[PDB]
Amino acid sequence: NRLKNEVIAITGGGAGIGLAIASAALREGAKVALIDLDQGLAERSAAMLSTGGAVAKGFGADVTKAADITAAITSAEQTIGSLTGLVNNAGIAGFGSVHDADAAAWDRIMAVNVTGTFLASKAALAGMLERHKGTIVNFGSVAGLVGIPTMAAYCAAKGAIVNLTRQMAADYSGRGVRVNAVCPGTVTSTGMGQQLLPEVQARRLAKYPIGRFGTPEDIAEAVIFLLSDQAAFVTGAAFAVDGGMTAI
Amino acid sequence: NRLKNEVIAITGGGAGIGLAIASAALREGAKVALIDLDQGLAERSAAMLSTGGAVAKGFGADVTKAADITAAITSAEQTIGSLTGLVNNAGIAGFGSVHDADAAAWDRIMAVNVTGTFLASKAALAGMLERHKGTIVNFGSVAGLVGIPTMAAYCAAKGAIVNLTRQMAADYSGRGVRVNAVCPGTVTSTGMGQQLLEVQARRLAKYPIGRFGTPEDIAEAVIFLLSDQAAFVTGAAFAVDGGMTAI
Amino acid sequence: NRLKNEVIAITGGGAGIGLAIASAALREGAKVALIDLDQGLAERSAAMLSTGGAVAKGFGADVTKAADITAAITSAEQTIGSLTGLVNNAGIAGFGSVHDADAAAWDRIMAVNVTGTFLASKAALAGMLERHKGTIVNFGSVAGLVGIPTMAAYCAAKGAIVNLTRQMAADYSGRGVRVNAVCPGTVTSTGMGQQLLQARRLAKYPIGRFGTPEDIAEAVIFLLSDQAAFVTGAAFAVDGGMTAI
Amino acid sequence: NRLKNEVIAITGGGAGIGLAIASAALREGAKVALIDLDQGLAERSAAMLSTGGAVAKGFGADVTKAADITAAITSAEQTIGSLTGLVNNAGIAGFGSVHDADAAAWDRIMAVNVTGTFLASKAALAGMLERHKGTIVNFGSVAGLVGIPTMAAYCAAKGAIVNLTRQMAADYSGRGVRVNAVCPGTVTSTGMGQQLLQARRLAKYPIGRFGTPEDIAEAVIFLLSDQAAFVTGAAFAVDGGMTAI
Numbered sequence: 001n002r003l004k005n006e007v008i009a010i011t012g013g014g015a016g017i018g019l020a021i022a023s024a025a026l027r028e029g030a031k032v033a034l035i036d037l038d039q040g041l042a043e044r045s046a047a048m049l050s051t052g053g054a055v056a057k058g059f060g061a062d063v064t065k066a067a068d069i070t071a072a073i074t075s076a077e078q079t080i081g082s083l084t085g086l087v088n089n090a091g092i093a094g095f096g097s098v099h100d101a102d103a104a105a106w107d108r109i110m111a112v113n114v115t116g117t118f119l120a121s122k123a124a125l126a127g128m129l130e131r132h133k134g135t136i137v138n139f140g141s142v143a144g145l146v147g148i149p150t151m152a153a154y155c156a157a158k159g160a161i162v163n164l165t166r167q168m169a170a171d172y173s174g175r176g177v178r179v180n181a182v183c184p185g186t187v188t189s190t191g192m193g194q195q196l197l198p199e200v201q202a203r204r205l206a207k208y209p210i211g212r213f214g215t216p217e218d219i220a221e222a223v224i225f226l227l228s229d230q231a232a233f234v235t236g237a238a239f240a241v242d243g244g245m246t247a248i
Numbered sequence: 249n250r251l252k253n254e255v256i257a258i259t260g261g262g263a264g265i266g267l268a269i270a271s272a273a274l275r276e277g278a279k280v281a282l283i284d285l286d287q288g289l290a291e292r293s294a295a296m297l298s299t300g301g302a303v304a305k306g307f308g309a310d311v312t313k314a315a316d317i318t319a320a321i322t323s324a325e326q327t328i329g330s331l332t333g334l335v336n337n338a339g340i341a342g343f344g345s346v347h348d349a350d351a352a353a354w355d356r357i358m359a360v361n362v363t364g365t366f367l368a369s370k371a372a373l374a375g376m377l378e379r380h381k382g383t384i385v386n387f388g389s390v391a392g393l394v395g396i397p398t399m400a401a402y403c404a405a406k407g408a409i410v411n412l413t414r415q416m417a418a419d420y421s422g423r424g425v426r427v428n429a430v431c432p433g434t435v436t437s438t439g440m441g442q443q444l445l446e447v448q449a450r451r452l453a454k455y456p457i458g459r460f461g462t463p464e465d466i467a468e469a470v471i472f473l474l475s476d477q478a479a480f481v482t483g484a485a486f487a488v489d490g491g492m493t494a495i
Numbered sequence: 496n497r498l499k500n501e502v503i504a505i506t507g508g509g510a511g512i513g514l515a516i517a518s519a520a521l522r523e524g525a526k527v528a529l530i531d532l533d534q535g536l537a538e539r540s541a542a543m544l545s546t547g548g549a550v551a552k553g554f555g556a557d558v559t560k561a562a563d564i565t566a567a568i569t570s571a572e573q574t575i576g577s578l579t580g581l582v583n584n585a586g587i588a589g590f591g592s593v594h595d596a597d598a599a600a601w602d603r604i605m606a607v608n609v610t611g612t613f614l615a616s617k618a619a620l621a622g623m624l625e626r627h628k629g630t631i632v633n634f635g636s637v638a639g640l641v642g643i644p645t646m647a648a649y650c651a652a653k654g655a656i657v658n659l660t661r662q663m664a665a666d667y668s669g670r671g672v673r674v675n676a677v678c679p680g681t682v683t684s685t686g687m688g689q690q691l692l693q694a695r696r697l698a699k700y701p702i703g704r705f706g707t708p709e710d711i712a713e714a715v716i717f718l719l720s721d722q723a724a725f726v727t728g729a730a731f732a733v734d735g736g737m738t739a740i
Numbered sequence: 741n742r743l744k745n746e747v748i749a750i751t752g753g754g755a756g757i758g759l760a761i762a763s764a765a766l767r768e769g770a771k772v773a774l775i776d777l778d779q780g781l782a783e784r785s786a787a788m789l790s791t792g793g794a795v796a797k798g799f800g801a802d803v804t805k806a807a808d809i810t811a812a813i814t815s816a817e818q819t820i821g822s823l824t825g826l827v828n829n830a831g832i833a834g835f836g837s838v839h840d841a842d843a844a845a846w847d848r849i850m851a852v853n854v855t856g857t858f859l860a861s862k863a864a865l866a867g868m869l870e871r872h873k874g875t876i877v878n879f880g881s882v883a884g885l886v887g888i889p890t891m892a893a894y895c896a897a898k899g900a901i902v903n904l905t906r907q908m909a910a911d912y913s914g915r916g917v918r919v920n921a922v923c924p925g926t927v928t929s930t931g932m933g934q935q936l937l938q939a940r941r942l943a944k945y946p947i948g949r950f951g952t953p954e955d956i957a958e959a960v961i962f963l964l965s966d967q968a969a970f971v972t973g974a975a976f977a978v979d980g981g982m983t984a985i
């Protein structure tokens with residue numbers, strides 16, 4: 001019951017890590033809104049999760065479109081109650097180095113990750129600040145803390161999210177809204193994990209002291225801790241959940 | 249039941265944050281060994297905690313004395329079972345800058361913090377490695393991540409613990425032992441917090457959240473890091489600091 | 496003579512820190528290209544600097560416009576020689592928190608800082624990689640390492656630059672191109688310094704003063720120099736102790 | 741002449757990186773004192789360096805012995821003038837994980853690195869603070885910023901130095917003494933480099949090579965110089981990109 005009486009909106013909640021966050025949040029007693037670019041996916045996943053009295057509802061929105069994400073959060077609150085938590089999990093990745101990256105792809109990666117975090121937070125903050133209560137979990141990555149070959153826009157975007165999190169915590173922690181970033185290591189099994197996939201495999205695994213990559217469930221547990229009132233003194237943190245990657 | 253079937257030794261467990269960690273760990277179903285320089289206090293605190301079927305036992309040891317901390321860990325395991333977790337909470341603080349610090353005072357702060365973490369971990373690691381299962385939580389501080397005026401030895405000590413944590417995670421994460429460091433902000437109410445007490449408003453201003461931490465705040469982070477829900481968390485310097493290191 | 500036979504392009508070179516970098520680089524024997532949104536300013540500043548045989552030339556370009564910045568870099572190389580160094584100094588700042596920021600202003604701040612760094616680097620990298628020799632200095636800030644109240648877009652932008660720098664170093668260090676970021680503390684006297692204008696502010700700086708454009712320029716000149724041959728991927732704090740406390 | 745009228749004491753100055761620092765500092769016009777555990781080595785190295793008008797003097801001291809390091813600094817100042825800079829370069833390394841490290845070896849690694857930095861700085865700070873002028877460069881490592889397998893005591897010691905540097909900068913930057921740490925990557929060619937001696941190790945370095953003593957020396961000379969007047973509290977990675985990935 002660690003999230004009893006919490007109401008959590010999760011962007012990109014239809015699949016992957018976002019969906020695993022939803023499952024764990026429901027386990028802990030929260031009501032959840034899955035907000036995803038793919039409306040059908042958000043609704044199918046919310047149906048799948050709403051067993052045994054658990055309450056999950058789905059909403060379609062592109063986090064890069066201010067009016068759409070704002071409308072989704074408004075609909076979510078009308079449906080499941082005023083938000084107490086927001087997880088800015090929506091993100092995309094792609095390849096391209098500074099010398100050869102496509103400028104349009106660059107912009108889209110920055111938009112979904114950085115602009116989406118900004119716009120979804122902006123929508124949620126109106127209510128959270130009014131109520132002097134909220135918790136926002138942003139999505140960094142090991143790729144936001146160190147450099148990853150051939151991923152210039154993505155490392156820029158996740159780097160932006162890491163420090164934006166610090167900035168938001170500076171503004172809002174004293175006003176009742178905690179803001180933290182989870183920084184996951186590689187999670188292979190999601191759509192993104194598959195997108196980014198022998199000797200080269202072994203070298204990649206060798207960057208992880210724990211000797212395995214992460215699961216969506218591994219990351220979801222850290223997010224559930226940060227959302228909970230047991231983390232009342234945690235704000236502004238870039239919490240590495242990465243099997244040791246950034247420790248070496 | 250987040251720590252069901254866990255057996256957790258907590259150095260400095262007799263009081264303050266260590267005691268709060270013990271309370272939360274028992275809440276989550278763990279068996280706890282309080283290991284404290286003050287043997288009587290460890291025992292009395294363990295007795296106090298042991299209600300409602302909760303199992304806490306107290307042991308005396310100075311973490312800077314290898315034979316003594318080794319004996320205490322062995323005795324704990326005889327009493328409550330093989331360790332699954334170790335919290336290196338024992339620490340001392342003090343004042344003194346590089347230009348005026350006394351060498352003996354410097355050495356003692358380094359000893360309890362860094363050498364204690366080393367020796368207590370060394371003792372626990374034999375069993376944890378043998379069983380390919382363990383979780384160690386070390387105690388950094390905001391004072392291990394940034395510089396604090398007039399606390400040279402203490403900032404060096406906590407700085408050491410922060411990077412030693414990364415080093416330990418590098419060695420052991422693949423062998424079944426996670427090692428992490430909680431880095432608390434100021435916690436006023438403990439013996440250490442009291443010891444270190446417009447100057448007030450200035451200190452508070454460094455904390456975006458607008459208050460200092462409680463032992464309970466810190467205990468919750470430690471309980472998370474101890475739990476199997478934190479299975480992919482290792483090598484982390486986890487700031488639990490009201491936003492201090494974010495600005 | 497620390498930058499003898501070096502050819503350095505400096506975005507935002509017409510004024511402020513960029514101009515101070517130009518002055519110091521010329522002192523050390525470099526030829527410099529001042530690339531500024533304000534073309535007249537770039538030209539006037541370059542002429543002012545071109546004394547005692549020093550070679551400084553001005554170019555007009557908005558770093559957020561790929562064609563324009565690419566053209567300026569191409570012309571710089573035609574004018575003063577193939578680049579050996581690029582300083583992505585161009586940046587803008589503004590105020591606004593997540594809950595109330597102008598989304599258009601947010602985009603412009605991200606564009607000049609992050610996209611400008613990307614596009615200018617992209618143009619320079621063709622030649623630098625072809626020659627297996629280059630040094631790129633990006634502009635972070637203390638605002639890219641910690642959070643600053645009421646500056647969401649700018650902290651996001653400088654945060655991006657800090658980690659983009661690491662990413663660029665990962666790609667290119669082994670190919671002969673070092674990439675580093677200078678992270679300055681507050682520098683009062685520039686246009687940006689004045690725009691953003693406080694014993695409380697000063698209290699954030701252990702050294703007990705804010706920085707000068709010259710302070711920052713010296714760090715950039717070191718990073719540009721071959722004396723810094725093993726320095727790459729670094730986020731170098733030049734900040735009077737700000738991020739140390 | 742970047743260090744004209746500077747007077748720099750270098751612990752561990754008789755060989756390796758310390759000696760390279762001495763050479764570069766003399767190049768830039770400083771007077772130097774080499775203070776080394778090996779007195780004869782300090783003397784021989786100082787004599788070797790004292791050509792063409794360069795002034796280098798050697799002294800014997802174990803930095804872990806307060807009386808010895810204090811005497812050496814005093815003797816240095818009698819010979820070459822009041823110190824303006826101190827480089828806490830003396831250090832030792834060794835292997836051992838938490839589970840198997842010998843406690844005596846642990847203490848010795850912690851002592852030379854951390855306690856030596858403390859004691860040497862303490863001796864130098866009396867004069868520097870009295871004059872409201874100094875610059876201190878401590879020696880971290882990539883091993884002070886991240887974990888290195890099988891080097892528990894050394895990683896703890898270098899970690900201590902990195903944050904002690906921040907703490908010292910907090911105390912003294914406003915009192916006229918800058919304090920910074922260089923954090924070098926692997927440097928193969930020194931006594932320590934040889935002691936610790938694969939392609940797997942090299943793969944940790946984006947730049948595709950290990951460092952030289954000269955690479956590290958240049959960063960130290962920059963930090964010592966007044967061109968770095970606003971640089972304090974910094975943990976400056978000079979590491980071929982190691983900590984960037």
Ligand SMILES: NC(=O)c1ccc[n+]([C@@H]2O[C@H](COP(=O)([O-])OP(=O)(O)OC[C@H]3O[C@@H](n4cnc5c(N)ncnc54)[C@H](O)[C@@H]3O)[C@@H](O)[C@H]2O)c1
Pocket residue numbers: 011012013014015016017018035036037038041061062063064088089090091092093112116139140141142183184185186187188190191192193
């Ligand atoms: N998979 C990894 O290895 C990994 C590692 C570190 C961090 N991350 C980060 O974790 C988060 C989740 O990653 P994942 O692996 O679960 O991703 P995923 O691609 O498996 O799932 C992402 C979900 O977000 C949605 N989405 C994409 N763009 C959107 C938009 N503009 N608006 C609303 N929704 C949108 C997708 O439709 C999708 O359902 C991301 O921010 C990602 O960058 C992933």
Ligand SMILES: NC(=O)c1ccc[n+]([C@@H]2O[C@H](COP(=O)([O-])OP(=O)(O)OC[C@H]3O[C@@H](n4cnc5c(N)ncnc54)[C@H](O)[C@@H]3O)[C@@H](O)[C@H]2O)c1
Pocket residue numbers: 259260261262263264265266283284285286309310311312336337338339340341360364387388389390431432433434435436438439440441
């Ligand atoms: N109180 C704070 O503000 C604060 C902030 C950040 C980090 N910390 C750290 O948290 C930890 C706990 O702090 P606290 O405020 O609870 O401390 P505390 O002084 O209130 O209590 C510490 C306990 O450790 C025991 N202890 C001391 N030396 C010991 C030794 N050599 N061997 C065994 N036990 C010993 C004491 O007897 C005591 O019971 C420490 O590592 C401390 O450095 C404290």
Ligand SMILES: NC(=O)c1ccc[n+]([C@@H]2O[C@H](COP(=O)([O-])OP(=O)(O)OC[C@H]3O[C@@H](n4cnc5c(N)ncnc54)[C@H](O)[C@@H]3O)[C@@H](O)[C@H]2O)c1
Pocket residue numbers: 506507508509510511512513530531532533556557558559583584585586587588607611634635636637678679680681682683685686687688
């Ligand atoms: N002044 C400070 O306190 C401070 C502190 C840390 C970092 N910085 C950073 O240092 C850099 C320089 O700052 P400054 O104080 O000298 O700035 P400034 O505003 O004084 O000067 C900036 C120059 O860049 C030019 N410029 C602006 N937009 C451009 C564009 N789209 N394309 C090309 N040129 C453009 C301007 O015309 C101007 O000449 C910036 O990246 C800034 O973010 C400044």
Ligand SMILES: NC(=O)c1ccc[n+]([C@@H]2O[C@H](COP(=O)([O-])OP(=O)(O)OC[C@H]3O[C@@H](n4cnc5c(N)ncnc54)[C@H](O)[C@@H]3O)[C@@H](O)[C@H]2O)c1
Pocket residue numbers: 751752753754755756757758775776777778801802803804828829830831832833852856879880881882923924925926927928930931932933
């Ligand atoms: N060589 C590397 O790969 C590397 C990398 C990063 C950092 N470092 C650090 O750089 C510094 C220099 O390393 P190096 O490779 O030149 O070492 P080195 O072993 O080659 O030389 C060190 C010198 O310090 C002296 N010394 C040792 N103990 C002393 C003591 N107790 N008191 C006074 N002098 C003492 C030695 O006599 C020796 O002349 C050290 O702090 C080291 O930890 C080295």
